[PDB]
């Protein structure tokens, strides 16, 4: 004798549609940074109502459309306006605002992500927001470009000896790594290749200049200084994950590609050291040659 | 040092203190108004208990600056129960407010209370409101309830079929239940009656379901009577085909079909044939199985059981067949006849094979035929490898063996027979032959860890593992407690758990990654072995398995899916 | 049906949620000012966690309407550690924040943190700062630390004796420690040297503290050498007292002294001597005792090796005595010599011979002489009954049997010599007479409900209990498997589970207020006594204890306190 109480089910479109208009208005108000007045119980109750009557497709499509429209029309124009000057700060501010808005929206709609998303096997609210931001902001035709040139520019300035905002570089690297949603795919795709290419070219030029400039001891000192500089830059500005490819290029260019130059070096070579009988030079040469295979 | 401690009774003390504070009615800071009634609570406990409250009290919305909070669409008693559970971690249910509590729990997305409510409702499941339960579990999308609801349906089919709600059930669900190999039934007559009741009115009695009906499950006389009583229809043609198939039991493993199988999961190891040393080693004609559901030595009567021992057991289409079989206990003489048991048909018909001048040989069933290599004579070495034809169950010729062996070790490793150990003449050979069925010739294989004879081979991790053995050629006629797995895939004698008991020619049986060895003759003990060792390759744990009531040597056993009634009795 | 469901993994989830909320940094309400620094936390958790915080925040005082609370006298790191423990249930400790954490945890009165800190401190106690630890423990009135410091100082007395701070200990404390029984030293001279070092300087050496020295436990052969070089003191009289005591081998139990106690703790049942039945068919002659600490029949002292089967057993002031013997079931071997084993001296001596070489009866050690109830010969009925006092060497006439009883059983119920049932030879009877020690006569008592004889009758819970027996109740000269006993002192039948092995002329001993059965011959049971079971008084059931490796029948076992020094090495 369970005696299950009866309960009605209704799908009146106009009533359903008005709920959607209210939810869209609330989401737009949140995106405009005006959440201090919006209620919580009403919105969560409405979101629960839309999932109980099997209308999740409408909710998901509307959320996607609203998020895309707002992000485009309120971020892309702003970034293009700030394209010339104050580029990193506005991008970081937009990223933080987008993250906060998305986390609040996810907080409102936990029922949708707990039922509908797992039922139909789609991306959650947070992942959807990250995907939209990656597709429509960071990976734009020109924004990605200017980002790469300015990043390589501050890298070159730091290599020369200038002072750059390491915090901004670190924040940009962290944002890029997060934007993959699983790992470093986007980080490898958009940032790693130009950085490695420019670093390789710069190190080849520096190695050629050092070889044409002085003897082997000066080359050893220069390569040690470069190693210290790159290991300080990766540990403070860049991400720790991009360490092995950098040292590989350093060894293959400043050491390996000049190994013959160290083989035939005069007044500082192995033959010169053996004839002089010195030991500090031999130790320095052994330390330099240990890193370079063969 | 910097040792760190961690207590375990701190959380309960904290909860008890919180409950005492709530009972004292002090330090309250939030009031919830539900349908017009006020409840006092603490903000932090609610915000740190569930996710609905966490967003409401910590998201940053207006609720930061409200003393009273309106709650709509919920029962006051439901909130009282929820708060009691939060403050106590003990939830008291009843038969009146269970629906309100369940709907409130589903509203706030709290898993533990949802699971408790579901368990209580199933424990108080009502026959007259099962559809009202499916509706409730469907609107709220409770995928964790529907599965065991269907499990309940498949174990009480007979009682529910009488009720008209069985006709009221959806066709898809009924078809899914009928096709499932879990219905608690004895004969296909009940299935036919249920199909008729679903496809016709109760008064009328007094198509699609027939697709799930196992026609061969009925008797030949029953099938003939149904065909005679049936009107001209393709159902009659199907019944005639089923009767004809039942009239060809000799081709039972060559006439397999989805409706020609049983409906159970009772995979157990059944020992049949062989010689039991107590009280005299003779070819037994009874099946001594090790029932895990009963967990004991179950007894059965194998029909048409040949007087053979250590015969190769082949299990195809839920039908067991015996090939060769040395009868050195009753006199060394090869038997060309073969005996077959049909657990699927609940009977056994001796499907005799052709001339197979080999003993202690096993054939791996690849396609319509079965490939076998090496082999042994009645009491000595032999190289007459004989293949099998399951369609005619005929023992035909096979590829020649590399060398003659006696009581050798052999295992089908990934569709390729591997033969190791064995006794060429009197001398125990250590050469390994990899007779791949695809290559139809011997190939290189890992050498046996023990260069002995009469050593059984098991299929551990899809590898021919050699363990036990009892022969003087191993150094002495003593128990070999060292077991190494001759992994042909790795091609090496990988380390394995040492064998607790050393006994040569022991029958192996793999039951859920547990390759136990039982029976055989132990040279160290000077008699047959009546103990088994339960070891798992994955778990690496070896202990004492089931012990037989009588020591046996040169016996045969195989793991197969038996009828559910047999496992239940 | 209502049913209540209670979770188990909810409190920890709540704690994790609270920790995450605190790490986020929201819903904070109260701020504590400690050492000029701010720590921000929640009111409710603090109020419900401790008791001092509960009083401060829910006591009705001013802190209801104050945003910040300024604490005094506690270190900032201490508050950080306490809050981390409250939020995370863990605790991190080091060698630099352990002193300042105990002070803060002892002031807020939190027991778990105090216990953890005490454990950590004991994990790093040494001989260089033990006085500081004692001062800290006594200052804070801690009693869980100065009950483990004594344990450490006793376990390492020799090592600490060389420390300079050893002379700085209070005289009362060191006197109490020296007089304790847990102090382990292989002799009684090292303690004297330590006492001299405490009382006099090392150069001067090479009082009351010497009073704790156990002279009778030391070797008397060095007493003459000590007295020659001894300074003028009354200690010479004490030394000479040991010489007089050493000349009292037959009076050593009678010459017991408070300073003659055994400075150790090992009391159990020792089974030595007798006639082993299986698997060795020879009479046992070596005296070895099973060690309960090791749970095996390991080697032990061969003190008072009796050349008899099922001899008598008595324990007079931790001294074992044996006389007589009877093994009529498997061949009686009566003995007249009495042997005494002194655990205090750990030696053997010839005890006073009994007036009559009689056995197969019950002996109660009451009064100045152990008295035998009823009596019989080695294999026949006899009236020879007497009371033996080996310490006083007094063989006196005792109360004779009121009725013809042979191979009867009895026990000292409520400190009174009594017997249960009996047998006029082979015919079992229920006549029971209790010999009153005051009247020295066999006074009439309640008759035994079960007419059992040659059984093991003991006193459990101050109640007579007999298990098994060898009488006519089994139909022959076998062991009755049924267990039935009635305690007259308790006045009721105390039914017990049947003995796994027949109690036929076995050795029954009671350890830890629980009787046990080990050994004997069970003719009716069809097997020997290959198991030992102890009947727990609280459980009222027999649990399989350490089974004897030899199924012997007719070996007596005593129960007494043995020197734990031998067991420790």
Curated annotation (Swiss-Prot), chain A:
Tissue spec: Brain, spermatozoa, and testis (at protein level). Widely expressed.
Compartments (UniProt record): Nucleus; Golgi apparatus; Cell projection, Cilium, Flagellum; Cytoplasm, Cytoskeleton, Spindle
Entry comment on modification after translation: Neddylated. Attachment of NEDD8 is required for the E3 ubiquitin-protein ligase activity of the BCR complex. Deneddylated via its interaction with the COP9 signalosome (CSN) complex.
Positions of region (Interaction with KLHL18): 1-27
Miscellaneous comment in the UniProt entry for this protein: High-glucose conditions in renal tubular epithelial cells lead to up-regulation of CUL3 expression, significant increase in CUL3-mediated ubiquitination of MRPL12 and dysregulation of mitochondrial biosynthesis.
Function: Core component of multiple cullin-RING-based BCR (BTB-CUL3-RBX1) E3 ubiquitin-protein ligase complexes which mediate the ubiquitination and subsequent proteasomal degradation of target proteins. BCR complexes and ARIH1 collaborate in tandem to mediate ubiquitination of target proteins. As a scaffold protein may contribute to catalysis through positioning of the substrate and the ubiquitin-conjugating enzyme.
Disease: Pseudohypoaldosteronism 2E: An autosomal dominant disorder characterized by severe hypertension, hyperkalemia, hyperchloremia, hyperchloremic metabolic acidosis, and correction of physiologic abnormalities by thiazide diuretics. Neurodevelopmental disorder with or without autism or seizures: An autosomal dominant disorder manifesting in infancy and characterized by global developmental delay, variably impaired intellectual development, and speech delay. Some patients have seizures, others have autistic features or behavioral abnormalities. Additional variable features include cardiac defects, failure to thrive, or brain imaging anomalies.
The protein, known as: Cullin-3
Protein species of origin: Homo sapiens
Organism placement in taxonomy: Eukaryota, Metazoa, Chordata, Craniata, Vertebrata
Gene from which this protein is expressed: CUL3
Curated annotation (Swiss-Prot), chains B, C:
Mapped Kelch repeat ranges: 268-318, 319-368, 369-415, 417-462, 463-513, 514-562
Localization per record: Cytoplasm, Cytosol; Cytoplasm, Cytoskeleton, Microtubule organizing center, Centrosome; Cytoplasm, Cytoskeleton, Spindle; Nucleus
GO molecular function: 14-3-3 protein binding; ubiquitin-like ligase-substrate adaptor activity
Keyword annotations from UniProtKB, A to Z: Acetylation, Cell cycle, Cell division, Cytoplasm, Cytoskeleton, Disease variant, Kelch repeat, Lysosome, Mitosis, Nucleus, Phosphoprotein, Repeat, Ubl conjugation pathway
GO biological process: cell division; cellular response to amino acid stimulus; cellular response to L-leucine; mitotic sister chromatid segregation; mitotic spindle assembly checkpoint signaling; negative regulation of autophagy; negative regulation of type I interferon production; positive regulation of cell growth
Phosphotyrosine sites (modified residues): 435
Location, primary (coarse class): cytoplasm
Associated pathway: Protein modification; protein ubiquitination
Residues annotated as domain BTB: 28-95
The keyword Nucleus appears for this protein: yes
Stored InterPro entries: BACK, BTB-kelch_protein, BTB/POZ_dom, Kelch-typ_b-propeller, Kelch_1, KLHL22_BACK, SKP1/BTB/POZ_sf
One Pfam family of this chain: Kelch_KLHDC2_KLHL20_DRC7
Positions bearing Phosphothreonine: 432, 444
GO cellular component, one term: polar microtubule
Role played: Substrate-specific adapter of a BCR (BTB-CUL3-RBX1) E3 ubiquitin ligase complex required for chromosome alignment and localization of PLK1 at kinetochores. The BCR(KLHL22) ubiquitin ligase complex mediates monoubiquitination of PLK1, leading to PLK1 dissociation from phosphoreceptor proteins and subsequent removal from kinetochores, allowing silencing of the spindle assembly checkpoint (SAC) and chromosome segregation. Monoubiquitination of PLK1 does not lead to PLK1 degradation.
Annotated disease: Defects in KLHL22 has been found in a patient with isolated coloboma, a defect of the eye characterized by the absence of ocular structures due to abnormal morphogenesis of the optic cup and stalk, and the fusion of the fetal fissure (optic fissure). Isolated colobomas may be associated with an abnormally small eye (microphthalmia) or small cornea.
Something else known: Potential oncogene that is up-regulated in breast cancer cells and promotes tumor growth.
Subunit structure, as described in the record: Component of the BCR(KLHL22) E3 ubiquitin ligase complex, at least composed of CUL3, KLHL22 and RBX1. Interacts with PLK1. Interacts with DEPDC5 (via DEP domain); the interaction depends on amino acid availability. Interacts with YWHAE; required for the nuclear localization of KLHL22 upon amino acid starvation.
Identification of the protein by name: Kelch-like protein 22
Encoding gene (name): KLHL22
